[PDB]
């Protein structure tokens, strides 16, 4: 993070980080842990439960996360067909 | 008087998919140029985070009438990093 002596507050890009902060089950402990190991929410939605887990330190947090991003709220306004 | 909202069930059912749907209404509004009907139109398209990001910008703009420059904007925040410098593309920078 830079061999100035300023802080990384002046960059951070608003767009994709406010999309990982407005994900559920991730809060600002996940949030770091996430970008440090990860780039950006695609890396993030590329990894698999395990992956996930590991950087955010807890299992449950890691559930809701992935399953968020693997599910749709069309699932649970309307379930027609679907093994869950 | 209607035999619905009984169950446990229900709420469950309410709590999640009126969850789900917030979280991917304001992910999508993220994005400066993207609006929370905006959010709305990528929802109807499709419904879900995965199918977002694995959307390219062209599928992005293929959403009803919703926004070729939106696409673009959603696909850069969906590939950038969230420290917004990369520690090298093509040049390699601090790293640290």
């Given at each position: 993070?830079?061999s ?46 395990d ?15 992935y ?18 | ?21 917030s ?6 509004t ?6 929370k ?22 599928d ?18 969906l ?18």
């Open positions: 993070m830079d100035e002596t300023l802080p990384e507050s002046e960059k951070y890009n608003p767009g994709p980080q406010d999309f990982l902060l407005k994900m559920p089950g991730v809060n600002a402990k996940n949030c770091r842990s996430l970008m440090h190991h990860v780039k950006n929410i695609a890396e993030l939605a590329a990894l698999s439960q992956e996930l887990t590991s950087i955010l330190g807890n299992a449950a947090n890691a559930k809701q996360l399953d968020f991003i693997h599910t749709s709220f069309a699932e649970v306004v309307s379930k027609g067909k679907g093994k869950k | 008087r209607i035999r619905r909202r009984y169950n446990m069930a229900d709420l469950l059912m309410e709590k999640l998919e009126q969850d789900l749907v979280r991917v209404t304001e992910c999508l993220t994005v400066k140029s993207v609006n009907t905006d959010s709305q139109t990528l929802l109807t398209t499709f419904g879900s985070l995965e199918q977002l990001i694995a959307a390219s910008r062209e992005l703009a293929l959403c009803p009438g919703l926004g070729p420059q939106k696409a673009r904007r959603l696909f850069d925040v590939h950038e990093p969230f420290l917004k410098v990369p520690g090298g593309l093509e040049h390699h920078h601090h790293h640290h």
